[PDB]
Symmetry: C2
Subunit: 160 residues, 2 copies
């Protein structure tokens, strides 16, 4: 096949944020939707690490915006968890489900609230995030913000 190979290089390049290298590999025929052993695509890795330009390019090159890993997480989950709000905006503008559930039944808003990312929380809400969605343990994003003492996130959520 020639590759891949190429996808493993692509996944690694997307994780590092090397945008030029991402271009070449895709040109060289690297599957933009290749996944690792954890089921993570280049889009999963770029989004997790906050590489907005790589995230944008990958989508332009046909990357699946709601791909799920072995934990059922979309790239939006990773961006929300790690507080990368520009990545969040880009993914949402490209048709990512704002209320996508992982294996634990958690939305991106759950992750943002738990990790205290107020800016991300606001973006998600604006994008139409259901603030009263609860996971498999019946817990809302607001509940997680309270446990972990994220008081600014707490405030933002009860004003809804």
């Amino acid at each position: 096949w020639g590759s891949s190979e190429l996808g493993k290089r692509l996944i690694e390049a997307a994780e590092n944020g090397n945008k030029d290298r991402v271009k070449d590999l895709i040109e060289n025929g690297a599957d933009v939707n290749a996944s690792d052993s954890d089921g993570r695509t280049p889009l999963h890795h770029a989004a997790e690490n906050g590489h907005a330009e790589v995230v944008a390019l990958l989508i332009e090159k046909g990357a699946d915006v709601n791909a799920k890993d072995s934990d059922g997480r979309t790239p939006l989950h990773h961006a929300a968890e790690n507080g990368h709000d520009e990545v969040v905006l880009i993914l949402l503008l490209k048709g990512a489900d704002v209320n996508a559930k992982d294996s634990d039944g958690r939305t991106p808003l759950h992750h943002a609230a738990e990790n205290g990312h107020k800016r991300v929380v606001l973006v998600l809400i604006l994008a139409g995030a259901d603030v009263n969605t609860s996971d498999s343990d019946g817990r809302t994003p607001l509940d997680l913000a309270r446990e972990h003492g994220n008081e600014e996130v707490v405030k933002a959520l009860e004003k809804q």
Copy 2:
């Protein structure tokens, strides 16, 4: 009548959240405006005082108030790249496609001043990216003109 209005506008402009709450309690009009027609909300948004902005709106501030130039507080926040304020305003019913005296939306200002995240937020909130002003110019036109290459791309993929 009020000098309380002057102090409130002043306090909001400076981001003094405590001083703002006191004046409002002491009967200061939250919708007072200077000679330029700018409210405390206009000043808080222009200088990116997010907590003051939220506080003013809760105390009944008009989110879509127009100044002498027809600018809303969202125009000011977009121009100066205060994306948190932009978020708060939009979440409080601010009109994303409000036109000033020149027929420009907040997207025009964000694009002109090279504020990429505000651009993204505005578009996500439903900003018409192909609105032309009274000169027939779109936000993309303004972005290309000022060499805001990142904004140019962001508006080209739309």
